[PDB]
A paper describes a structure:
SARS-CoV-2 Mpro is a cysteine protease that forms a dimer composed of two protomers. Each protomer comprises the chymotrypsin and 3C-like peptidase domains I and II (residues 10–99 and 100–182, respectively), with the active site consisting of a Cys145-His41 catalytic dyad located in the cleft between the two antiparallel-β-barrel domains. In addition to the indispensable role in viral replication, SARS-CoV-2 Mpro also plays an essential role in escaping antiviral defense by cleaving host cell proteins.
Crystal structures of 11 Mpro mutants provided structural insight into their altered functionality. We employed crystallographic structural analysis together with a high fidelity FRET activity assay by our group to assess the functional and structural changes in Mpro mutants. The crystal structures of several variants revealed the changes in side chains orientations of residues in the active site comprising substrate binding pockets, especially S2 and S4, which might lead to altered amino acids preferences. Accordingly, changes in KM values for most of variants were observed, indicating alterations in a mode of substrate binding. We observe the highest level of conformational plasticity around the S2′ and S3′ binding pockets with N142 and S46 being the most flexible residues within the structures we solved. Also, we observed that the charge distribution in the active site changes quite dramatically even upon a single substitution especially around the S3′ and S2 binding pockets. This might explain why with most mutants we see the changes in binding affinities and not the kcat values.
Author numbering:
A (entry chain A), B (entry chain A): 1 to 306
């Protein structure tokens, strides 16, 4: 029993974290087989970042201009390419610590673990949700660029996120590992508006199920609701609209706890229209939306990996 | 910028996690050099746990009765000892993946990362506080026993906690790595009362400083307070009494933000006596007490390890 925001174990990803230095700037890189992946703004200074021409800036660099360190080893760069917003540095040596891995572009609403790194050195690990507006609310200091978010299913590391910047608004934006930004953002130091954000309704429902499994039951009522009726309430409170695909994803949680999805919706509408009345759910006084239905099932059943 | 509940990277600890099976029961063990550490109730069944005589039960076992698996390797037990509530299993092979490490007994109020494991296999990692009443509010399913909490400073893994049981009340209790329980608990399946718990006041203050560093400032006031006056409020709201040792530990945070500790106290008393008024601090509507002043400084400055 008990419910926690849990990160994936970060072992397999720590062995891939390296330090990339091009002249001034140093940030983190990801060393898989014999390629190092890092944000291309490693070739920028801080004034370059106002309006950079990455094409021109990278023509000014050669293989030997990229200093890449993996702990103690200084690594040997023998080929450099630009794919969208990431730099691919070809290296002399394959990483003996390369896990089985995939590159994945995730969906808004899905979660992942971030390994925050500085100078190629892991600092700590935390769980994140990709907001509906393609930002993440992370913890990233100067030099954290190149840090990666990832999922693990048994033996495979699915890399989904690389950190590139912090918006003036304080939230964070980055790319997949092919270098395509999530959201409308660009790697330029200018004002960039994130969309209006909303709450991930299917995730709040999963968390309510997790709460029932763990004994917090006060929010359950015998009222019920329709899907279309619940969605009028969702729209009023800036919740993502619930679809039948979401109901179906909540199927196993429904079946374990014996509470139909539309009964949990009627519980949720009541929470939205009346608050918690100084009570808490799983020791929180807000509605939590960073647990997918898969996260709840893995934690409430004990799925492990390697 | 940004502030998250961050766990330590779990790489160095994953390589020590093994699976220990004695007849019926299987749980996790910790393999350092050539000794495996696990809870001694691995030699119990579920009825043994009502009132076990560990002395007698362990006399019934031999070296070859302990099946210990490290991933694929089946490990060779050649000596078994009982130290308080932990079993020490001597093994044929030293762990090539043994990190630099210490055994530490921590203080109530300190925090640590837990690597939740099942069958010797890591499931995920989260950050914990040792409550003033020596429980922890974790996420532990059946078979999670033997999981360990730990800290890391640069290259050293300081093991402080091993999980042994879940109380009927839903909270968790365990030992240091010498096998001495934290708190008044025993490894027996009986009703066991945890003390009255309280809130870790020095930690709530550290988190308020973290909030100021990150731009949340609405709770600051120009009122102030004395230490003795603040402590009357603390006692009314079941907060741990603030001492001068606590004020001194908050020194660096005080100096970074320019807010004296007693000014933050007057902010806190106001929060305690008036609530948040539907506002949030670092995206939370409760006062957070799982960040030590060291945790805040490490995250707000970027301390790394290996």
């Amino acid at each position: 029993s008990g419910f926690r925001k849990m990160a994936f174990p970060s072992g397999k990803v720590e062995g891939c974290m390296v330090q990339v230095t091009c002249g001034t700037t140093t940030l983190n890189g990801l060393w898989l087989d014999d390629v190092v992946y890092c944000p291309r703004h490693v070739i920028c200074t801080s004034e370059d970042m106002l309006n950079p021409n990455y094409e021109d800036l990278l023509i000014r660099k050669s293989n030997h201009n990229f200093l890449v360190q993996a702990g103690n080893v200084q690594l040997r760069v023998i080929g450099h390419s630009m794919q969208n917003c990431v730099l691919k540095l070809k290296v002399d040596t394959a990483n003996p610590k390369t896990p089985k891995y995939k590159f994945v572009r995730i969906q808004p609403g899905q979660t992942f673990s971030v390994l925050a790194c500085y100078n190629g050195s892991p600092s700590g690990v935390y769980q994140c949700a990709m907001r509906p507006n393609f930002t993440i609310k992370g913890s990233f200091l100067n030099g954290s660029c190149g840090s990666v978010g990832f999922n693990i299913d048994y033996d495979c590391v699915s890399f989904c996120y690389m950190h590139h910047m912090e918006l003036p608004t304080g939230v964070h934006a980055g790319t997949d590992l092919e270098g395509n930004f999530y959201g409308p953002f660009v790697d330029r130091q200018t004002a960039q508006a994130a969309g209006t954000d909303t709450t991930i309704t299917v995730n709040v429902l999963a968390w309510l199920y997790a709460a029932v499994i763990n004994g917090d039951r006060w929010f359950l009522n015998r009222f019920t609701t329709t899907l279309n009726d619940f969605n009028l309430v969702a729209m009023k409170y800036n919740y993502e609209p619930l679809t039948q695909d979401h109901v179906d994803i909540l199927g196993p949680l429904s079946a374990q706890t014996g509470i139909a999805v539309l009964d949990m919706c009627a519980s949720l509408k009541e929470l939205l229209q009346n608050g918690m009345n100084g009570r808490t759910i799983l020791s929180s006084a807000l509605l939590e939306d960073e647990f997918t239905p898969f996260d709840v099932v893995r934690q409430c059943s004990g799925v492990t990996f390697q």
